[PDB]
Protein backbone atom coordinates (compact mmCIF):
# COMPACT_ATOMS: atom_id res chain seq x y z
CA UNK A 1 0.00 0.00 0.00
CA UNK A 2 1.55 3.23 -1.29
CA UNK A 3 0.64 6.87 -1.82
CA UNK A 4 0.12 7.70 -5.49
CA UNK A 5 -0.38 11.14 -6.99
CA UNK A 6 -2.98 11.06 -9.78
CA UNK A 7 -5.52 13.16 -25.24
CA UNK A 8 -7.15 9.82 -26.11
CA UNK A 9 -6.58 9.30 -29.87
CA UNK A 10 -9.85 7.36 -30.18
CA UNK A 11 -11.49 10.79 -29.94
CA UNK A 12 -10.17 11.57 -33.46
CA UNK A 13 -8.81 8.48 -35.28
CA UNK A 14 -10.42 7.06 -38.41
CA UNK A 15 -8.69 3.70 -38.91
CA UNK A 16 -11.71 1.87 -37.44
CA UNK A 17 -13.67 2.98 -40.56
CA UNK A 18 -11.04 2.73 -43.30
CA UNK A 19 -9.56 -0.64 -42.21
CA UNK A 20 -10.14 -3.80 -44.21
CA UNK A 21 -11.03 -5.28 -40.78
CA UNK A 22 -13.16 -2.44 -39.39
CA UNK A 23 -14.55 -2.21 -35.90
CA UNK A 24 -16.79 -0.17 -33.62
CA UNK A 25 -16.24 0.88 -30.02
CA UNK A 26 -18.27 -0.14 -26.98
CA UNK A 27 -18.31 2.10 -23.91
CA UNK A 28 -17.15 0.44 -20.67
CA UNK A 29 -17.87 2.86 -17.81
CA UNK A 30 -17.11 2.18 -14.16
CA UNK A 31 -17.25 5.02 -11.59
CA UNK A 32 -15.39 2.70 -9.17
CA UNK A 33 -12.43 2.69 -11.62
CA UNK A 34 -9.67 4.93 -12.85
CA UNK A 35 -9.89 5.33 -15.85
CA UNK A 36 -13.66 5.60 -15.39
CA UNK A 37 -14.36 5.04 -19.12
CA UNK A 38 -12.55 2.73 -21.50
CA UNK A 39 -13.61 1.91 -25.06
CA UNK A 40 -13.36 -1.66 -26.33
CA UNK A 41 -13.33 -2.62 -30.01
CA UNK A 42 -15.57 -5.27 -31.54
CA UNK A 43 -14.75 -6.43 -35.05
CA UNK A 44 -17.48 -5.43 -37.45
CA UNK A 45 -17.31 -8.42 -39.80
CA UNK A 46 -16.31 -12.07 -39.64
CA UNK A 47 -14.08 -11.77 -42.70
CA UNK A 48 -12.25 -8.83 -44.23
CA UNK A 49 -13.23 -6.29 -46.88
CA UNK A 50 -11.86 -7.00 -50.35
CA UNK A 51 -11.13 -4.58 -53.21
CA UNK A 52 -14.76 -4.72 -54.35
CA UNK A 53 -16.01 -3.58 -50.94
CA UNK A 54 -17.36 -7.01 -49.96
CA UNK A 55 -16.58 -9.26 -46.99
CA UNK A 56 -14.14 -12.04 -47.89
CA UNK A 57 -14.86 -14.76 -45.33
CA UNK A 58 -11.70 -16.76 -46.12
CA UNK A 59 -9.77 -13.92 -44.44
CA UNK A 60 -10.43 -13.25 -40.74
CA UNK A 61 -11.06 -10.02 -38.83
CA UNK A 62 -9.51 -10.53 -35.40
CA UNK A 63 -9.25 -8.21 -32.38
CA UNK A 64 -5.89 -7.10 -31.00
CA UNK A 65 -5.72 -7.00 -27.22
CA UNK A 66 -3.56 -5.02 -24.81
CA UNK A 67 -3.22 -5.57 -21.07
CA UNK A 68 -3.78 -2.29 -19.21
CA UNK A 69 -3.35 -1.10 -15.63
CA UNK A 70 -6.50 0.10 -13.83
CA UNK A 71 -7.32 1.23 -10.28
CA UNK A 72 -10.31 -0.29 -8.47
CA UNK A 73 -11.69 1.48 -5.39
CA UNK A 74 -11.09 -0.44 -2.15
CA UNK A 75 -8.04 4.02 -1.44
CA UNK A 76 -7.57 1.80 -4.52
CA UNK A 77 -6.34 -1.61 -5.65
CA UNK A 78 -4.00 -1.82 -8.67
CA UNK A 79 -5.23 -4.39 -11.22
CA UNK A 80 -4.64 -5.45 -14.83
CA UNK A 81 -7.30 -6.11 -17.50
CA UNK A 82 -7.35 -7.24 -21.13
CA UNK A 83 -8.87 -4.73 -23.57
CA UNK A 84 -9.65 -5.12 -27.28
CA UNK A 85 -8.32 -1.97 -28.90
CA UNK A 86 -8.75 -2.60 -32.65
CA UNK A 87 -9.01 -5.29 -35.31
CA UNK A 88 -6.56 -6.63 -37.91
CA UNK A 89 -7.01 -8.91 -40.93
CA UNK A 90 -5.30 -12.33 -40.84
CA UNK A 91 -4.90 -15.15 -43.27
CA UNK A 92 -5.90 -18.41 -41.53
CA UNK A 93 -2.76 -20.16 -42.91
CA UNK A 94 0.62 -19.06 -44.21
CA UNK B 1 -3.47 11.78 -4.08
CA UNK B 2 -4.70 8.24 -3.27
CA UNK B 3 -3.63 5.08 -1.46
CA UNK B 4 -2.96 2.17 -3.83
CA UNK B 5 -2.80 -1.45 -2.72
CA UNK B 6 -0.17 -2.87 -5.08
CA UNK B 7 -1.16 -6.38 -3.85
CA UNK B 8 0.64 -9.14 -5.81
CA UNK B 9 2.30 -6.94 -8.46
CA UNK B 10 5.97 -7.52 -9.22
CA UNK B 11 8.44 -6.37 -11.82
CA UNK B 12 9.10 -8.55 -14.87
CA UNK B 13 11.82 -8.44 -17.52
CA UNK B 14 -1.43 -15.61 -30.82
CA UNK B 15 0.59 -15.21 -34.03
CA UNK B 16 -1.50 -12.40 -35.55
CA UNK B 17 1.63 -10.25 -35.86
CA UNK B 18 2.78 -12.62 -38.64
CA UNK B 19 -0.48 -13.74 -40.27
CA UNK B 20 -1.87 -10.17 -40.55
CA UNK B 21 -2.02 -8.42 -43.91
CA UNK B 22 -0.42 -5.52 -41.99
CA UNK B 23 2.21 -7.49 -40.02
CA UNK B 24 4.29 -5.93 -37.25
CA UNK B 25 7.38 -6.41 -35.11
CA UNK B 26 7.58 -5.71 -31.37
CA UNK B 27 10.20 -3.32 -29.99
CA UNK B 28 11.29 -2.92 -26.38
CA UNK B 29 10.23 0.30 -24.66
CA UNK B 30 12.28 0.25 -21.42
CA UNK B 31 12.19 2.83 -18.60
CA UNK B 32 13.51 1.82 -15.15
CA UNK B 33 11.67 4.86 -13.70
CA UNK B 34 8.33 3.33 -14.70
CA UNK B 35 6.07 0.46 -13.74
CA UNK B 36 5.76 -1.61 -15.88
CA UNK B 37 9.36 -0.83 -16.80
CA UNK B 38 9.26 -2.75 -20.12
CA UNK B 39 6.44 -2.34 -22.65
CA UNK B 40 6.55 -4.10 -26.03
CA UNK B 41 5.35 -1.74 -28.78
CA UNK B 42 4.43 -2.67 -32.34
CA UNK B 43 5.96 -1.15 -35.46
CA UNK B 44 4.43 -2.15 -38.79
CA UNK B 45 6.76 -4.12 -41.06
CA UNK B 46 5.83 -2.30 -44.30
CA UNK B 47 4.31 0.90 -45.58
CA UNK B 48 1.85 -1.26 -47.54
CA UNK B 49 -0.23 -4.38 -46.90
CA UNK B 50 0.38 -8.01 -47.93
CA UNK B 51 -1.69 -9.16 -50.92
CA UNK B 52 -2.96 -12.64 -51.84
CA UNK B 53 0.35 -13.43 -53.59
CA UNK B 54 2.32 -12.60 -50.45
CA UNK B 55 3.79 -9.37 -51.89
CA UNK B 56 3.42 -5.85 -50.49
CA UNK B 57 0.81 -3.59 -52.11
CA UNK B 58 1.69 0.03 -51.44
CA UNK B 59 -1.63 1.52 -52.52
CA UNK B 60 -2.87 0.24 -49.11
CA UNK B 61 -1.45 1.41 -45.74
CA UNK B 62 -0.24 -0.58 -42.73
CA UNK B 63 -0.99 1.70 -39.77
CA UNK B 64 -0.42 1.24 -36.01
CA UNK B 65 -3.28 0.83 -33.56
CA UNK B 66 -2.85 2.87 -30.39
CA UNK B 67 -4.18 2.48 -26.85
CA UNK B 68 -3.94 5.01 -24.05
CA UNK B 69 -2.64 3.28 -20.94
CA UNK B 70 -1.93 4.11 -17.30
CA UNK B 71 1.62 3.70 -15.97
CA UNK B 72 3.28 4.34 -12.61
CA UNK B 73 6.13 6.83 -12.60
CA UNK B 74 8.89 6.86 -9.98
CA UNK B 75 8.82 9.83 -7.53
CA UNK B 76 11.96 11.05 -5.76
CA UNK B 77 12.33 9.71 -2.20
CA UNK B 78 12.02 13.20 -0.70
CA UNK B 79 8.40 13.12 -1.95
CA UNK B 80 5.44 11.91 0.14
CA UNK B 81 4.22 9.85 -2.84
CA UNK B 82 6.01 6.72 -3.94
CA UNK B 83 4.49 6.89 -7.43
CA UNK B 84 2.99 9.30 -9.96
CA UNK B 85 0.15 8.10 -12.18
CA UNK B 86 0.56 8.95 -15.88
CA UNK B 87 -1.07 8.35 -19.27
CA UNK B 88 0.98 7.26 -22.30
CA UNK B 89 0.17 5.91 -25.77
CA UNK B 90 1.22 2.45 -26.90
CA UNK B 91 0.98 0.83 -30.34
CA UNK B 92 -0.41 -2.67 -29.82
CA UNK B 93 -0.44 -3.92 -33.43
CA UNK B 94 -1.19 -2.81 -36.97
CA UNK B 95 -4.19 -2.73 -39.28
CA UNK B 96 -4.55 -2.34 -43.04
CA UNK B 97 -6.44 0.74 -44.18
CA UNK B 98 -7.55 1.99 -47.56
CA UNK B 99 -6.24 5.52 -48.19
CA UNK B 100 -9.30 6.46 -50.27
CA UNK B 101 -12.72 4.94 -50.99
CA UNK B 102 -14.29 4.66 -54.48
O1 LIG C 1 -5.43 -15.76 -49.14
C1 LIG C 1 -5.65 -14.58 -49.49
O2 LIG C 1 -6.57 -14.21 -50.27
C2 LIG C 1 -4.75 -13.54 -48.92
C3 LIG C 1 -5.01 -12.18 -49.13
C4 LIG C 1 -4.17 -11.20 -48.59
N1 LIG C 1 -4.37 -9.82 -48.77
C5 LIG C 1 -5.50 -9.57 -49.65
C6 LIG C 1 -6.87 -9.44 -49.08
C7 LIG C 1 -7.15 -8.76 -47.89
C8 LIG C 1 -8.47 -8.68 -47.45
C9 LIG C 1 -9.50 -9.26 -48.19
C10 LIG C 1 -9.22 -9.93 -49.38
C11 LIG C 1 -7.90 -10.01 -49.82
O3 LIG C 1 -7.54 -10.67 -51.00
C12 LIG C 1 -8.73 -10.99 -51.72
C13 LIG C 1 -8.36 -11.62 -53.05
O4 LIG C 1 -7.38 -10.84 -53.72
C14 LIG C 1 -7.98 -9.86 -54.55
C15 LIG C 1 -6.86 -8.96 -55.05
O5 LIG C 1 -7.13 -7.64 -54.61
C16 LIG C 1 -5.96 -6.84 -54.83
C17 LIG C 1 -5.28 -6.46 -53.54
O6 LIG C 1 -6.28 -6.20 -52.56
C18 LIG C 1 -5.63 -6.04 -51.34
C19 LIG C 1 -4.25 -5.96 -51.21
C20 LIG C 1 -3.68 -5.79 -49.94
C21 LIG C 1 -4.50 -5.72 -48.81
C22 LIG C 1 -5.89 -5.80 -48.94
C23 LIG C 1 -6.45 -5.96 -50.21
C24 LIG C 1 -7.90 -6.07 -50.48
N2 LIG C 1 -8.82 -5.32 -49.65
C25 LIG C 1 -9.08 -4.05 -50.18
C26 LIG C 1 -8.48 -3.54 -51.34
C27 LIG C 1 -8.80 -2.25 -51.78
C28 LIG C 1 -8.14 -1.77 -53.00
O7 LIG C 1 -8.33 -0.55 -53.29
O8 LIG C 1 -7.41 -2.60 -53.63
C29 LIG C 1 -9.72 -1.45 -51.07
C30 LIG C 1 -10.32 -1.96 -49.91
C31 LIG C 1 -11.30 -1.33 -49.03
C32 LIG C 1 -10.99 -1.23 -47.68
C33 LIG C 1 -11.91 -0.71 -46.79
N3 LIG C 1 -13.15 -0.28 -47.16
C34 LIG C 1 -13.45 -0.38 -48.47
C35 LIG C 1 -14.71 0.03 -48.91
C36 LIG C 1 -15.08 -0.06 -50.25
C37 LIG C 1 -14.20 -0.56 -51.19
C38 LIG C 1 -12.94 -1.00 -50.79
C39 LIG C 1 -12.56 -0.91 -49.44
C40 LIG C 1 -9.98 -3.24 -49.50
C41 LIG C 1 -3.07 -11.59 -47.84
C42 LIG C 1 -2.78 -12.93 -47.62
C43 LIG C 1 -1.58 -13.17 -46.83
C44 LIG C 1 -1.52 -12.58 -45.57
C45 LIG C 1 -0.38 -12.76 -44.81
N4 LIG C 1 0.69 -13.49 -45.22
C46 LIG C 1 0.63 -14.06 -46.44
C47 LIG C 1 -0.48 -13.92 -47.29
C48 LIG C 1 -0.49 -14.53 -48.56
C49 LIG C 1 0.60 -15.27 -48.99
C50 LIG C 1 1.70 -15.40 -48.16
C51 LIG C 1 1.71 -14.80 -46.90
C52 LIG C 1 -3.63 -13.91 -48.16
Residue numbers in the entry:
A (entry chain B): 44 to 49, 58 to 125, 132 to 151
B (entry chain A): 44 to 56, 64 to 152
From the paper:
The Interleukin 17 (IL17) family comprises several structurally-related dimeric cytokines that are elicited by infection and other immunological stimuli. The preeminent family member is IL17A3, which forms homodimers and can also heterodimerize with IL17F. IL17 proteins drive and amplify inflammatory responses in a wide variety of cells including keratinocytes, fibroblasts and lymphocytes. Here we present a new class of inhibitor molecules that interact with IL17A at a novel C-terminal binding site.
To recapitulate this direct interaction on the other side of the molecule, we next substituted the other amide in the linker with an ethylene glycol to make Cmpd 10. This compound gave us an X-ray co-crystal structure as seen in Fig. 5B, where no major changes in protein structure/gross rearrangements were observed. Isothermal titration calorimetry experiments with Cmpd 10 showed stoichiometry consistent one molecule bound per IL17A homodimer, where it gave affinity of 44 nM. Cmpd 10 also showed increased SPR affinity (43 nM) relative to Cmpd 9 and showed inhibition of IL17A/IL7RA-Fc interactions (IC50 740 nM: Fig. 6A). Cmpd 10 inhibited IL17A/TNF stimulated cells with IC50 1.3 µM, compared to a much weaker TNF-only stimulated IC50 > 50 µM. Subsequent molecules further increased affinity to IL17A (KD < 100 nM for Cmpd 10) and importantly could also block signaling of IL17A in cellular assays (IC50 1.3 µM for Cmpd 10).
